[PDB]
Amino acid sequence: RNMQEKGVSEKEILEELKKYRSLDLKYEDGNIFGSMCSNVLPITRKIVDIFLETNLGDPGLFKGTKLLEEKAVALLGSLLNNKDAYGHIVSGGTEANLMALRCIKNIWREKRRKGLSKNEHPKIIVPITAHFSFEKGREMMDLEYIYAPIKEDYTIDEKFVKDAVEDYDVDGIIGIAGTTELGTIDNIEELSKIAKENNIYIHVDAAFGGLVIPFLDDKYKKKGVNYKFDFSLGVDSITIDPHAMGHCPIPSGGILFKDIGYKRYLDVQATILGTRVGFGGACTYAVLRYLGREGQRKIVNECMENTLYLYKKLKENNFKPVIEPILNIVAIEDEDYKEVCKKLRDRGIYVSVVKALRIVVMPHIKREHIDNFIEILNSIK
Amino acid sequence: RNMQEKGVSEKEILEELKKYRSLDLKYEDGNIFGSMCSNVLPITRKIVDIFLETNLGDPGLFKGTKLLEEKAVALLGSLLNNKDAYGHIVSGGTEANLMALRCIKNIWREKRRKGLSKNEHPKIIVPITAHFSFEKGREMMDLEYIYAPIKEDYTIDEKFVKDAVEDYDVDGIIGIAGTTELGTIDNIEELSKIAKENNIYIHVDAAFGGLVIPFLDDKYKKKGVNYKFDFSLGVDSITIDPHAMGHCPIPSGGILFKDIGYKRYLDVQATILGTRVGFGGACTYAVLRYLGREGQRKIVNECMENTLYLYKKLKENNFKPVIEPILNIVAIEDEDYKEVCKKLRDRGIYVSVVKALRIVVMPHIKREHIDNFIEILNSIK
Ligand SMILES: Cc1ncc(COP(=O)(O)O)c(C=O)c1O
Ligand SMILES: Cc1ncc(COP(=O)(O)O)c(C=O)c1O
Ligand SMILES: [N+]
Ligand SMILES: [N+]
């Protein structure tokens, strides 16, 4: 516990660390059911080693690692239908969302300096399903949120947004492509039309869904759900995280803006962090190149196959999924959800907690794990 | 540049990445003279591999990695004379400073809710030598800074601070233990007395110096410079970064608060980031344990030996250091500093840019590199 005068040997400290690591869960062990992280693609371990001693906070010293960040951003942009995107491979979806909020706020500041806004703080429409990073941004940056309600399918009420934009002077709209709790997809196409018609910035949070939705086989797509979310809709920015469904090591988050014109509104380097990893960009570029669309499609639809297997097994055992799954996320309605979560923990099953248990069917979740999960859950009931 | 349907082999993508890495500089090659990062302790590469698939954003899944973060914080706290510190191993000094600012701001908010502050925004005294992360915080969080001037020795003017605290209602004071440009140490002892006597929060930015100052041999300490900066002075928080002079891989920053009572003012998890590495805490704990005070002392004073060698060689060659060095940082006065920096770049010497060139004598800078540097600089002149 205290700092010591004398050092210890490598063998002593590594065996201590391994003892602590043995207290952790591991993704591959059939314990973790409620996380949007998973095992990294094995090749990334080598890449992390190669790029460990780089720093994208000083890109003039690491020109190649900086180029690889630009290439990673370009590949994500291509996936999102935008060959001119301006962006960064940042620390995660939180920093990405915070940077989009900073941009929204600085567009507002410029208006305020010209007398073109009656808002004393940026006014941003945010669905109540938004990830907590949006609350961190509100709290830090003194934003005013207009919380948008959700419809029966748990997607943002587009008519509310349109009415609010008519009633109020609005500085930004947030839409979510893959909500944290349920994996639902807001109607970005309609939100983007509202935004374009009213000259309002729109940010899409695709932290999770951005690397799932473009790869979904048709049999997993649902009638009447719109899967369009990217720059083909003319949106201003998109968060999309390789360390979620991109199989990249933390920290690998992504923020893309429609073009380089947005960079000036990130002025105070454009990232929140200063000193920052170079291996995230290298891993993001390398994994997307190594897999190609074919390899990512295979992984995404394997997860969707296991998601629909879990959904089927749940109904067969008389459990009530909140919704038919859209992405590789299923939630189980339960009034005793807190106690059931604890009882599951006691038996080696870690879900997250909507009066529901959330299951994220990442690539580490296999059929045998779902079978084991159902068996344990029945026993609890 | 575009996303492709077909993937590529591991050999193809690794050889592409290695070609980009070959465009980077490497710390050990005698090129990088102006960075506060350096080579990591080799043992950390193994630790990164062991802890790569952990996430301190979900510490209930990684109990051992979470304990190692707590142990890392405790070892830093012990080094800083505080066995009860509450803190986190975060992404860097920027996030650490931003968290201290959030705490300052939320203490102010509570006062505002009670009518105990006439300030419409937190008012914080910040020396003009402060790192740019403080500007990021100001810009995001709408802080009001009272910029404190520096004295002839480039440390904060304590009389200005005292006068300002008498004149104004002040919500926070920043002092720097190891300035970014010159490595100077503010008079934290006096600033802490002012702060305590007036019930003002004081944050110490020891991002760089926190892992240098406690290890300085007496022959490097200068008469009349006060080296006291830590919790023995009763300060409220300290930033201290293992990925600077702790030889830990990015991301390994540190933020410590005086006790657990500060955690409530970080409420909106207490970090800015969500999903976040677990290997920083493991590396921080392991490196401090592996080295002990003896091993870190050896490294710090080796750097100081090379710093004073560089200082001596500069004067012998008629160059004008800005100051006699305090930490392992020397700056060279030069009116043509921009052009000289570019000419140095062209010859393989990368310094940073006070009309001066900044040299940070990290552990990768050896005597032969300083000799080579002086030779090249003379030739330019
Ligand atoms: C929709 C969404 N956005 C953003 C985030 C934040 O991502 P991170 O934890 O990488 O900061 C989350 C994390 O899962 C999320 O679900
Ligand atoms: C004094 C000081 N504080 C904070 C920082 C920010 O640290 P980071 O780049 O790790 O965010 C710097 C970086 O060197 C610094 O010099
Ligand atoms: N998680
Ligand atoms: N640097």
Q: Which residues of A touch B4 (CB under 8 A)?
A: 289, 292-293
A58 lines ligand 4 (CB under 6 A): yes
Q: Which residues of B154-169 are buried (b: 16+ CB within 10 A; e: fewer)?
A: bbbbbebbbebbeeee
Which residues of chain A does B74 touch, with a Cβ-Cβ cutoff of 8 Å?
1-2
Q: Are strands A253-257 and A237-239 parallel, antiparallel or unpaired?
A: antiparallel
* Residue in the block written with tokens 């920096």: B341
Q: Give dist(CA B211, CA B240) in Å, integer.
A: 7
Q: Could you tell me the sign of the dihedral formed by the alpha carbons of A344, A245, A70, A287, in that order?
A: positive
Closest approach of B287 to chain A, Cα-based (Å):
9
State the Cα–Cα distance between residues A108 and A122, nearest whole angstrom.
6
Q: Which amino acid, residue A16?
A: E
Q: For residue A19, how many C-alpha atoms fall within 13 Å in the half-sphere facing its CB?
A: 7
Contacts of residue B213, Cβ cutoff 8 Å, sequence gap at least 6? B177, B178, B185, B206, B227, B229, B327
Cα–Cα dist A175/A181, whole Å: 15
**Chain A environment of B297 (Cβ under 8 Å):** none
Most distant CA atoms of chain A, gap in Å: 69
Sign of the CA dihedral running A303, A305, A306, A310: positive
**Single-letter amino acid code for the residue at A116:** L
CA of B170 to the centre of ligand 1 (A): 36
Pairing of β A123-127 and β A172-176? parallel
Closest CA to A181 of A202, A155, A201: A155
Nearest CA, atom 1, ligand 3? A35
Spatial separation of the C-alpha atoms in residues B246 and B214, rounded to whole Å: 12
Reduce the DSSP state of residue A124 to 3 states and report it. strand
Which residues partner with B239 through β-bridges? Answer: B205, B255
- Dihedral of CA atoms A36, A39, A42, A43 in degrees, nearest 10, equals 20
Q: Please report which ligand is nearest the Cα atom of B206.
A: 2
What are the residues whose beta carbons fall under 8 Å from the beta carbon of A231, sequence distance 6 or more? A77, A80, A81, A82, A85, A238, A256, A258
Mutate to test the pocket of ligand 1, among A37, A135, A181, A208 (most ligand atoms within 8 A of CB): A208
Write down the CATH superfamily of domain A10-41+293-380. Answer: Aspartate Aminotransferase, domain 1 (3.90.1150.10)
Among B35, B251, B295, select the one facing A277 at the smallest CB separation. Answer: B251
CB pairs under 8 A between A and B: 278
How many angstroms separate the CA atoms of B108 and B122, rounded? 6
Distance in angstroms (rounded) separating the CA atoms of residues A247 and A38:
7
Q: Cβ(A228)–Cβ(A189) under 8 Å?
A: yes
CA distance B300 to B63: 33
Nearest CA in chain B to A64: B20
Tokens standing for B266?
């970080």
A207: nearest CA in chain B? B275
All CATH 3.40.640.10 domain ranges of chain A, comma separated, are 44-291
Per-residue tokens: B124? 């914080």
Q: What is the dihedral of CA B294, B300, B301, B306, to 10 degrees?
A: 150
Q: What are phi and psi of A155, to 5 degrees?
A: -105, 160
Q: Is the CB of A325 within 6 Å of ligand 1?
A: no
Among the listed residues A322, A309, A319, the one whose alpha carbon sits nearest the alpha carbon of residue A371 = A309
Task: Take residue A150 and report the two structure tokens written for it.
Answer: 């959700």
Q: In chain B, which residues fall in CATH 3.90.1150.10?
A: 10-40+292-380
Which ligand has an atom closest to residue B210 CA?
Answer: 2
Report the amino acid identity of residue A45.
R
User: Could you give the CA distance from residue A164 to residue A184 in angstroms, rounded to a whole number?
Assistant: 22
* Residues forming beta bridges with residue A126, ordered by sequence position: A147
- Nearest chain B CA: its distance from A266 CA (Å): 10
Determine the distance in angstroms separating the CA of B261 from the nearest CA of chain A, rounded to an integer.
20
The answer to whether the CB of B55 is under 6 A from ligand 3 is: yes
Method: X-ray
Burial of A153 (0-12, 13-18, 19+ CB in 10 A): middle
Q: Which residue of B has its CA nearest to A22?
A: B64
On whether the CB atoms of residues B344 and B351 are closer than 8 A, the answer is yes
Tokens of B230: 């830590």
Paired tokens of B275: 């999903």
Is residue B323 within 8 Å of B155, Cβ to Cβ?
no
Q: Which of B126, B148, B151 is nearest to B138 (CA)?
A: B126
The pair of structure tokens assigned to B175 is 């002092």
Nearest one of B151, B130, B134 to B143, comparing CA atoms? B134
**Which token pair is B324?**
């006699």
Eight-class DSSP state of A80 = T
- The CB of B186 under 6 Å from ligand 2? The reply is no
Quick check: CB of A352 below 6 Å from ligand 3? Answer: no
Using CB atoms, pick whichever of B3, B94, B250 lies closest to residue A277: B250
CB B177 within 8 A of CB B188: yes
3-class secondary structure, A190: helix
Q: Is A90 exposed, middle or buried (0-12, 13-18, 19+ CB in 10 A)?
A: buried
Residue A198 structure tokens: 């009213």
Q: Ligand 1, residue A179: give the atom nearest the CA.
A: 1
In chain B, which residues have their Cβ closer than 8 Å to the Cβ of A280? none
d(CA A254, CA A250): 12
Q: What is the resolution of this structure in A?
A: 1.8
Here the tokens at position A336 are 């005793």
Task: Report angle CA A306, A308, A312 to the nearest 5 degrees.
Answer: 115
Closest ligand (CA of A245)? 1
Ligand 4 contact via B35 beta carbon (within 6 Å): yes
> B44-291: which CATH number, 1.10.1740.10, 3.40.640.10, 3.40.50.720, 2.40.30.170?
3.40.640.10
Q: Does ligand 3 lie within 6 Å of residue B269's CB atom?
A: no
> Distance between CA atoms of B185 and B209, rounded to whole angstroms?
8
CB contact under 8 A, A141 and B140: yes
Q: Which atom of ligand 2 is nearest to the CA of B178?
A: 1
Distance CA B203, CA B96 (A): 10
Q: Which of B23, B65, B243 sits opposite A63 (nearest CB)?
A: B23
Q: Does domain B10-40+292-380 have CATH number 2.70.180.20?
A: no
The 3-state secondary structure of chain B reads CCCCCCCCCHHHHHHHHHHHHCCCCCHHHCCECCCCCCCCCCHHHHHHHHHCCCCCCCHHHCHHHHHHHHHHHHHHHHHCCCCCCEEEEECCHHHHHHHHHHHHHHHHHHHHHCCCCCCCCCEEEEECCCCCHHHHHHHHHCCEEEEECECCCCCECHHHHHHHHHHCCCCEEEEEECCCCCCCECCHHHHHHHHHHHCCEEEEECCCHHHCHHHCCHHHCCCCCCCCCCHHHCCCEEECCCCCCCCCCCCCEEEEECCHHHHHHHCCCCCCCCCCCCHHHHHHHHHHHHHHHHHHHHHHHHHHHHHHHHHHHHHHCCCCECCCCCCCEEEEECCCHHHHHHHHHHCCCECECCCEEEEECCCCCCHHHHHHHHHHHHHHC
